[PDB]
Amino acid sequence: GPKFPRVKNWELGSITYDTLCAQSQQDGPCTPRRCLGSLVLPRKLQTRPSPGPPPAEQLLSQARDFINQYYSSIKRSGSQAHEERLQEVEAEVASTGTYHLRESELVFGAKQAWRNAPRCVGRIQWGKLQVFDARDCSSAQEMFTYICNHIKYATNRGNLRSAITVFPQRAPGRGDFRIWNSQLVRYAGYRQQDGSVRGDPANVEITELCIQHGWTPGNGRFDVLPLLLQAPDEAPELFVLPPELVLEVPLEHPTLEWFAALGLRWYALPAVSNMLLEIGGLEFSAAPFSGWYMSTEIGTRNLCDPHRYNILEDVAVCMDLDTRTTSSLWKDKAAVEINLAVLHSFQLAKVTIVDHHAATVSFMKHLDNEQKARGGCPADWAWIVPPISGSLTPVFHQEMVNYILSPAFRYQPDPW
Amino acid sequence: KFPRVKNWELGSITYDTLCAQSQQDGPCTPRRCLGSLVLPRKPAEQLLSQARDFINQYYSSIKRSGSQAHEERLQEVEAEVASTGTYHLRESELVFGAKQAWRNAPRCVGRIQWGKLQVFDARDCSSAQEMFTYICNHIKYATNRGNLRSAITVFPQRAPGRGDFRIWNSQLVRYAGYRQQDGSVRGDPANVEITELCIQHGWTPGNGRFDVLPLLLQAPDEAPELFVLPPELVLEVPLEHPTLEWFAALGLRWYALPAVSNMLLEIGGLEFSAAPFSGWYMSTEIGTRNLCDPHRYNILEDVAVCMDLDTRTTSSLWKDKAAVEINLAVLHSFQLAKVTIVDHHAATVSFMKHLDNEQKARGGCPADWAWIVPPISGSLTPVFHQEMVNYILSPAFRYQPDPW
Numbered sequence A: 001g002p003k004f005p006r007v008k009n010w011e012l013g014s015i016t017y018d019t020l021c022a023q024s025q026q027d028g029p030c031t032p033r034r035c036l037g038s039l040v041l042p043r044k045l046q047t048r049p050s051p052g053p054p055p056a057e058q059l060l061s062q063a064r065d066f067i068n069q070y071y072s073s074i075k076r077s078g079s080q081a082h083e084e085r086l087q088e089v090e091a092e093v094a095s096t097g098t099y100h101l102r103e104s105e106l107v108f109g110a111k112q113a114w115r116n117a118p119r120c121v122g123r124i125q126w127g128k129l130q131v132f133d134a135r136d137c138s139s140a141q142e143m144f145t146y147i148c149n150h151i152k153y154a155t156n157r158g159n160l161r162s163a164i165t166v167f168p169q170r171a172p173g174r175g176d177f178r179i180w181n182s183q184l185v186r187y188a189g190y191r192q193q194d195g196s197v198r199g200d201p202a203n204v205e206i207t208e209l210c211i212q213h214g215w216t217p218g219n220g221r222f223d224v225l226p227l228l229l230q231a232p233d234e235a236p237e238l239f240v241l242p243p244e245l246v247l248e249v250p251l252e253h254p255t256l257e258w259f260a261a262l263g264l265r266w267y268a269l270p271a272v273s274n275m276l277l278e279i280g281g282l283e284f285s286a287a288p289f290s291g292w293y294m295s296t297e298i299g300t301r302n303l304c305d306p307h308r309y310n311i312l313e314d315v316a317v318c319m320d321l322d323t324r325t326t327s328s329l330w331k332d333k334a335a336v337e338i339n340l341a342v343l344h345s346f347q348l349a350k351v352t353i354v355d356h357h358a359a360t361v362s363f364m365k366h367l368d369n370e371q372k373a374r375g376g377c378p379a380d381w382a383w384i385v386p387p388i389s390g391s392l393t394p395v396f397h398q399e400m401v402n403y404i405l406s407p408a409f410r411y412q413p414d415p416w
Numbered sequence B: 001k002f003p004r005v006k007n008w009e010l011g012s013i014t015y016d017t018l019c020a021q022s023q024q025d026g027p028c029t030p031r032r033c034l035g036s037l038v039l040p041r042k043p044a045e046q047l048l049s050q051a052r053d054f055i056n057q058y059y060s061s062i063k064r065s066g067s068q069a070h071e072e073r074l075q076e077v078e079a080e081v082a083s084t085g086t087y088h089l090r091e092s093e094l095v096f097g098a099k100q101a102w103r104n105a106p107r108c109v110g111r112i113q114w115g116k117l118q119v120f121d122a123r124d125c126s127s128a129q130e131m132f133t134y135i136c137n138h139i140k141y142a143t144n145r146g147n148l149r150s151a152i153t154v155f156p157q158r159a160p161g162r163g164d165f166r167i168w169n170s171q172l173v174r175y176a177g178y179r180q181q182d183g184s185v186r187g188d189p190a191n192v193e194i195t196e197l198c199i200q201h202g203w204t205p206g207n208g209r210f211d212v213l214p215l216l217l218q219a220p221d222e223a224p225e226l227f228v229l230p231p232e233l234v235l236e237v238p239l240e241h242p243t244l245e246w247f248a249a250l251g252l253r254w255y256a257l258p259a260v261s262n263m264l265l266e267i268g269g270l271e272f273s274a275a276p277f278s279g280w281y282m283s284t285e286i287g288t289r290n291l292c293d294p295h296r297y298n299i300l301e302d303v304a305v306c307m308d309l310d311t312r313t314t315s316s317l318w319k320d321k322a323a324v325e326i327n328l329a330v331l332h333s334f335q336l337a338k339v340t341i342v343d344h345h346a347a348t349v350s351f352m353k354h355l356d357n358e359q360k361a362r363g364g365c366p367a368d369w370a371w372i373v374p375p376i377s378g379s380l381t382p383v384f385h386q387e388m389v390n391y392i393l394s395p396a397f398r399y400q401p402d403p404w
């Protein structure tokens, strides 16, 4: 009947229609001929910068759309203040080629970008975001101050709080503010003479950049990287995070006493720093944000990916499993105990964390909330379903519709 | 252009040029991706173009394209369509077509096996009774006392203005699901509807959790008929665990043969509404989905309690622990009973090899990532880290409506 995607839950038998996808103004990577939904970074997901501001016609339409979004969210659509704000944006773009967001618009926009993020299972929390306005920042040194404050506020001694800090937007003929690091906290990856890697192989490139830029390298598996911070039209400067600001959790297992002897650990705060926050056509190239971890990010991906710390076989050996045959399920067994250790250790340390069952259950609640609020919720099934125990969580059995809404967090090319 | 396809574990890149051979729309558009949907939402020149394409594929496959046999065959097909609005395949074409359809199935992790498929031609079938005989033979052949062999049996194609041959059951082997008026379901809840259909066509029910269903077989424009399978035909494996002695006490079992029987086989524009096929099980189908899905047997909590796990909270990972042991028991029991089965690690490793074979052979391979990645331990398998392109190639296996 309804001219919209029909969405089914196969556990419960229930049916919804997504009308929200009608609001999408940007194409994704799929066509009637082939689905490219499993691609991490298709050409249709990456952006590209250009030294001059967008066609004013293009900016204006994106801006008017956002201003409309804003005035709706405060139930003043069609009002005199709504129309005057539009005029003010048209005028500002007409004379300068760009415009600026009021503070409450920036707050609404940051929350909406999170709410719109199809790959995030944590969106039940979308309305609880502390927005630090840093659009006054004028130096790399000052970015560091703002970032340290963010870290202190967000970490809160283990009672984590979601936050984003927004640095000045891209400007016509002026260099970007950029944080070179992909996260505020990253372990070094040192390429050994044998070709193997000590530390986190995900971080080889950023490690060597830090070294090129004068950082004296350690040689551990868990060396915290310094930040490479870039103010407009300047070489990036190097900043060492004071160790007491970086909360870490040593990993131990509730019953396997040898696990603590492994010397594994992870940091408390997942703070992503290389993403572009786009609002009403405005581009915030530096806008780091943080929440708290879902345990599978640490226990399954970062610790067990073959191209990350790759500890599965080591743990399986300690567990005395048969690692000579796939059918012993030694990988599945070790992976479970590693995830358990992550959960147990974070709880012991009083550091906020959520397991993949609690997380996906809460994401189902989010889906129902959004069905009523907006008539749908953009969601990337492959990313929402956790990397272990897929069909054991409710999201596996939930069909999802994926599409791009703005405000958005977007990937952007590396500054170098 | 053509999609750049990357493996994130190895850093290796391919380009899929095979997708350009797709003449059939999937559900996605540039505005929104619908890849996670289980089912699709919904003259004679068209048939003729599909027929030619397929005949071309066939003669290319035996490397005799442009031959006299090739040109004469195209003319036979064209003459037959022009006069009758349809045509018929030669057995060798059908054997090639059935293998290609499996090969092209984006949701199948077992495609390394695609060239090894026994094709039974059952197109000279005129009655439900004859359908039953063919099905029993298929089952006997494919089961092979536990040394499972992949097979397909192809019943007569659809013809305009006449009902289809259909097997109403979704698989040749299904356990009954009896709806207890106290809300619940005894047996397999996936099969409540077929179970009830059987009863009202005269089946005398059981009351167990694992009662094997009769087949409802339908010849064109006739009520379906009921046929009970001879119990010696249905090989089953009692489930036990290698170390937890209490596991056997759960009374769990599963059948050996995954024989799917409700899909439509399309070859060269011709449609085969009954063409049941079978291979062997990947252990997660049974251990994870069939036994642990909340809307299937849903045994996670029973096993967890037996394992004395803390059910009170998600963060004990009781679900994950119990699932692992359930999958282990399935593997162990099948291996003990000498019945073919493949674990999800071995299966995904073979599929990676298959992807590489196909890249060299065809320049790509249609794959549905969400269906290829197993339902436990996803990122622990190599397929999780492999980008895939999904598209429809013909010959194809397709869904079709239930005939009731």
Ligand code: HEM
Binding pocket: A110, A114, A117, A119, A120, A121, A122, A123, A125, A129, A162, A163, A164, A289, A290, A291, A292, A293, A294, A297, A354, A359, A383, A409
């Ligand atoms: C509050 C607790 C939160 C949890 C448990 C959570 C969970 C997750 C997880 C598990 C992922 C997948 C990441 C990966 O596999 O690499 C993800 C992705 C994402 N998250 Fe959330 N998140 C939280 C808060 C936030 C916040 C505060 C923001 C932004 C304001 C955010 C925005 C995003 C975005 C944009 C992605 C897509 C990542 C990408 O494409 O690389 N999340 N989240």
Ligand code: HEM
Binding pocket: B098, B102, B105, B107, B108, B109, B110, B111, B113, B117, B150, B151, B152, B277, B278, B279, B280, B281, B282, B285, B342, B347, B371, B397
């Ligand atoms: C030889 C051993 C085989 C293995 C291990 C295997 C494995 C699998 C698995 C695990 C699935 C997903 C099923 C689900 O989750 O419901 C699947 C789907 C599928 N398989 Fe294979 N398979 C095998 C043989 C075959 C054969 C012989 C055929 C056809 C001749 C075939 C055609 C298909 C098709 C069409 C699907 C899609 C199912 C659907 O969309 O409902 N497979 N396979």
Ligand SMILES: Cc1cc(CCNCc2ccc3ccc(N)nc3c2)ccc1C#N
Binding pocket: A040, A041, A122, A270, A272, A290, A291, A292, A293, A294, A297
């Ligand atoms: C290497 C790579 C990785 C990724 C995913 C990173 N996603 C991390 C992330 C982002 C936001 C998060 C928010 C909360 C949270 N707990 N984890 C979060 C983790 C995408 C593209 C590329 C590339 N190229």
Ligand SMILES: Cc1cc(CCNCc2ccc3ccc(N)nc3c2)ccc1C#N
Binding pocket: B038, B039, B110, B258, B260, B278, B279, B280, B281, B282, B285
């Ligand atoms: C409820 C439902 C389920 C499905 C997937 C069934 N897929 C079974 C299947 C098919 C082929 C197989 C081949 C081999 C094998 N081991 N298992 C195989 C299992 C599709 C549509 C609906 C609907 N409506």
Ligand SMILES: C[C@H](O)[C@H](O)[C@H]1CNc2nc(N)[nH]c(=O)c2N1
Binding pocket: A038, A039, A040, A382, A383, A384, B008, B384, B385, B386, B387, B388
């Ligand atoms: C190839 C595939 O897209 C890739 O491995 C994806 C799959 N799903 C994911 N899901 C999450 N949450 N995070 C990821 O990095 C990925 N990686």
Ligand SMILES: C[C@H](O)[C@H](O)[C@H]1CNc2nc(N)[nH]c(=O)c2N1
Binding pocket: A010, A396, A397, A398, A399, A400, B035, B036, B037, B038, B370, B371, B372
């Ligand atoms: C909604 C989602 O597409 C659905 O639950 C899918 C996910 N992946 C799957 N993968 C396999 N192999 N089998 C399935 O039934 C499903 N179900």
Ligand SMILES: [Zn+2]
Binding pocket: A030, A034, A035, A036, A037, B028, B032, B033, B034, B035
């Ligand atoms: Zn798609």
